[PDB]
């Protein structure tokens, strides 16, 4: 019998040392771990965007309800959860006229259109941070829902705009009007395009916990963690514009228990392998990245990591690891983990209609296992993933570590998505924002940035 193992929910620490699994239950019931007191806004957008933001803030002040409050709980109200004042009285709103966006939006190809319009929305923010003495915690970019519509997917406006801000380190949050005033935008019929009516309160949750996080917020933190667990996430992105098919860019997201990760942009070089399409690092840049992360960890913590798990979506060759094992203190345990997504092992259930649980895992051997990060969770009484859950294959490619420990860490790393206040997620945070960070890095290639937190990436 191919027995499975259950690994309990990681549990997340909240304010006053309160440990609750759901992100938006111990948040409302207690509040954020760090109690920052002012989220003075700097909304940038059209006047209509300012009105939408003001109305949505007024809504957020009053409770918003979900039709299914068993699965998606409500929002008691910002100040009733975050005990801090985020209202429409204090706003450093900076206006962009409709014609201003229009003239920068009609430039034929998406290339010039996106570059010019991102520069338009970036010059205003840079000037605001430079020549004004009212330092607002977060800059809200309320983009009218025509840039996202007309200027659809470098592509991904959301990513290029965030990427060309790392040097200035301006914590910014980007919103769409259709996300805020979803009722106002409607199709040919009277039904709005985005029917959030059953999840309206949910839209109030994620929009809040993200904005709080970017305003120097720490909504929550892992409860059970070891003393030095530095998690490296090796993102990767082939430079399609590069004439050399080998050329590629990489980074390394360093994570402590705090859930706020530092991005160590790597060096663009020959990391692609078209013969088998596998990301690989040569000794020089491998040592450079590992040394950068190690020095940053020592500086922030005062000592070198006790353990270092490098998670990746592929397998590390021998040059990579033989380079990594050189620039690493003897008193350190370095491990390399491969986390594949599909690896077909669907497990349907004979009993009934609902799907398999979330903690179930199949351990193939001492160095391989399957983990069900998605599916049905009793607390929500719902399936995180529709259809049947797809497992997650985890193998300890290099180094010696306990597979159960790696599985538990990988499950715990799924509760650190501040950007979206949800029960959990299907991927660990180390590789969760792999495509996003890869596109950010590709957008910002020539400029070299130091170690920066996620507040400027996600």
């Amino acid at each position: 019998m191919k027995e499975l193992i259950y690994i309990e929910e990681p549990k997340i620490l909240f304010a006053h040392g309160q440990k609750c699994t759901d992100a938006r239950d111990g948040l409302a019931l207690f509040g954020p771990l760090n109690n920052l007191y002012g989220i003075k806004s700097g909304v940038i957008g059209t006047k209509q965007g300012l009105k939408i933001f003001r109305d949505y803030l007024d809504h957020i002040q009053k409770p918003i309800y979900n039709s299914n409050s068993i699965t998606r709980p409500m929002f008691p109200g910002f100040e009733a959860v975050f005990d801090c004042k985020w209202e429409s009285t204090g706003i450093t709103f900076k206006e962009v006229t409709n014609e201003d966006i229009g003239k920068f939006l009609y430039n034929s190809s998406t290339h010039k259109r996106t570059y010019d319009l991102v520069s338009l929305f970036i010059d205003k923010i840079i000037s605001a941070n430079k020549n004004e003495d009212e330092n607002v915690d977060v800059w809200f970019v309320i983009v009218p829902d025509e840039i996202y519509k007309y200027c659809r997917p470098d592509a991904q406006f959301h990513d290029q705009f965030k990427a060309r801000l790392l040097k200035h380190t301006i914590p910014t949050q980007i919103f769409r009007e259709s996300t805020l005033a979803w009722r106002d935008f409607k199709n040919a019929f009277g039904l709005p395009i985005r029917d959030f009516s059953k999840i309206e309160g949910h839209l109030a949750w994620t929009i809040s916990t993200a904005a709080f996080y970017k305003a120097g917020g720490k909504p929550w933190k892992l409860s059970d963690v070891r003393n030095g667990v530095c998690y490296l996430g090796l993102v990767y992105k082939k430079v399609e514009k590069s004439k050399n098919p080998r050329n590629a860019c990489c980074a390394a997201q360093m994570f402590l228990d705090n859930g706020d990760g530092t991005v160590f942009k790597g060096e663009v070089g020959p990391w692609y392998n078209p013969k088998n399409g596998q990301y690989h690092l040569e000794p020089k840049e491998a040592k450079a990245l590992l040394s950068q992360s190690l020095q940053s960890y020592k500086e922030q913590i005062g000592e070198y990591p006790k353990e270092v798990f490098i998670h990746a979506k592929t397998r590390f060759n021998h040059q990579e690891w033989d380079a990594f094992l050189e620039v690493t203190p003897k008193e350190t345990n370095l491990v390399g983990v491969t986390i594949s997504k599909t690896k077909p092992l669907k497990l349907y259930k004979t009993e009934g209609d609902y799907t398999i649980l979330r903690g179930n895992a199949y351990v193939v051997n001492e160095r391989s296992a399957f983990l069900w990060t998605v599916g049905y969770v009793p607390k929500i009484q719902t399936a995180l993933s529709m259809e049947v859950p797809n497992p997650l294959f985890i193998e300890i490619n290099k180094g010696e570590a306990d597979i159960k420990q790696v599985l538990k860490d990988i499950l715990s790393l799924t509760k650190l998505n501040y950007n979206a206040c949800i029960f959990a997620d299907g991927e660990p945070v180390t590789l969760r924002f792999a495509d996003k960070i890869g596109e950010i890095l590709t957008a910002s290639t020539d400029i070299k940035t130091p170690p920066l937190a996620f507040k400027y990436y996600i």
Partner: protein, 433 residues
């Protein structure tokens, strides 16, 4: 007397009651209300009245459009007024104006003259005002403690939503393999293999490893496009027991174990691809592997084994389908991947792939665990040749028996299956993340 009693129109005001009670318990204000007491007795009203008369020190009143209409709210209000008159207190009763629609006139005549703490603009401001009053009226409160609120919340809202130590049996998509051909043969064809001849197009699988030809088929198994092989000598051929290869005991410098296992994987994949040609199952080209489905009308009402393996969604027809891969570690199996293929009429295929993916997601939304399991098992049993397995053709005498019943997995902890509320709510929803 310390309880901060609350009355509300349940279930019209359960959320506000729970929120306010938890906040007041965390901040120290001990609270009492209908919720938080799921162990209701035969006579709950008696205990409520006893608490109001004796234990309650403040009487908050959730004032909503349906709070005044409800009879229980009015009864609790009358008892509160009686106790207040007995005590001769100015503000033993506090209406919490939580509803905008409740007009000034509509307010129940027993609370119109009592100043109401506002909640319409913000719940936080209302709680600030309540705390200010409680400080003014010197309402007792213990030291702030947010652990008790956590424990109470877990015991109340998270008692029937916790995993249970129950065993469940799951059906995988890994279909076992019973028997392999006795030996794997590497033929010394050398010059007998035509130059630039694609061995992929052959009656039986064969991999041109090095200068040899690796396969389970006999030397003479192929003669149509290989007539010269009639003169081949079996002495030169190399025979390696398949059992030894799979067990891993085999060790030779000519070829390593891993390469042999990869060769066997490719042979199994090609064998399945060839075998599905005989069956009356269509073909769809996936990214790398191949996918097989059933066209319209081949089965009697598209209900093989009383299971709907083909149906109609709006203007198109959806057919359930599979795709086969091979694995050998930790035990030989055929990986089956469910698919839904959408066709204009039931015999052709949709050229576009974006429409295919969109319709696949849309149809998967409407299907769930039971549907996917039933359709996969039905399709696999359809491909069966007998009541035990189906065979892939490697050689004239050699065949590989792949079972038609997937491997059974077992958990240790499980949950309880409530009604299909998720099906009732999630239906007709897309793009909300």
């Amino acid at each position: 007397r310390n309880k901060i009693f609350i009355s509300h129109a349940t279930p019209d005001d359960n959320d506000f009651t729970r929120w306010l009670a938890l906040k007041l318990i965390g901040l120290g204000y001990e609270v009492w209300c209908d919720i938080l007491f799921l162990d209701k007795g035969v006579d709950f009203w008696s205990n409520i009245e006893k608490v109001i008369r004796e234990d309650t020190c403040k009487f908050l009143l959730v004032s909503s459009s349906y709070s005044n209409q409800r009879e229980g709210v009015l009864k609790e209000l009358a008892v509160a007024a009686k106790v207040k008159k007995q005590l001769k207190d100015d503000k033993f009763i506090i209406p919490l104006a939580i509803d905008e629609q409740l007009s000034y006139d509509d307010i129940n005549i027993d609370i119109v003259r009592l100043n109401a703490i506002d909640f319409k603009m913000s719940w936080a401001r209302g709680l600030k005002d309540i705390l200010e009053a409680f400080e003014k009226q010197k309402v007792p409160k213990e030291v702030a403690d947010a652990s008790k609120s956590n424990l109470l919340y877990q015991q109340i809202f998270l008692h029937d939503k916790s995993v249970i130590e129950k065993e469940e049996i799951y059906d995988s998509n890994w279909l076992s393999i019973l028997s392999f051909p006795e030996e794997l043969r590497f033929h010394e064809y050398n010059w007998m293999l035509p130059k630039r001849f694609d061995v992929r197009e052959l009656t039986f699988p064969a991999v041109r490893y090095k200068n040899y030809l690796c396969t389970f088929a006999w030397a003479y198994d192929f003669t149509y496009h290989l007539p010269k092989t009639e003169t081949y000598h079996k002495s030169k051929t190399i025979r390696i027991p398949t059992e030894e290869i799979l067990s891993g005991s085999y060790d030779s410098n000519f070829i390593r174990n891993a390469e042999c296992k990869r060769l066997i994987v490719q042979l199994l994949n090609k064998a399945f691809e060839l075998r599905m040609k005989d069956k009356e199952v269509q073909e769809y080209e996936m990214s790398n592997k191949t996918a097989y489905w059933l066209e319209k009308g081949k089965l009697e009402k598209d209900k093989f084994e009383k299971t709907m393996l083909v149906g109609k969604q709006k203007d198109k027809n959806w057919h359930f389908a599979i795709s086969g891969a091979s694995k050998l570690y930790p035990f030989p199996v055929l990986m089956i991947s469910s698919h839904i293929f959408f066709t204009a009429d039931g015999k052709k295929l949709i050229d576009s792939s974006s429409v295919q993916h969109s319709s696949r997601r849309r149809q998967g939304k409407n299907w769930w665990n039971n549907t996917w399991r039933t359709k996969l098992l039905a399709f696999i049993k359809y491909l069966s040749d007998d009541d035990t397995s189906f065979y892939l053709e490697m050689g004239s005498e050699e065949k590989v028996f792949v079972s038609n019943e997937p491997v059974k997995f077992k958990g240790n902890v499980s949950y309880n299956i409530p009604e299909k509320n998720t099906l009732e709510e999630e239906a007709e929803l897309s793009g909300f993340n």
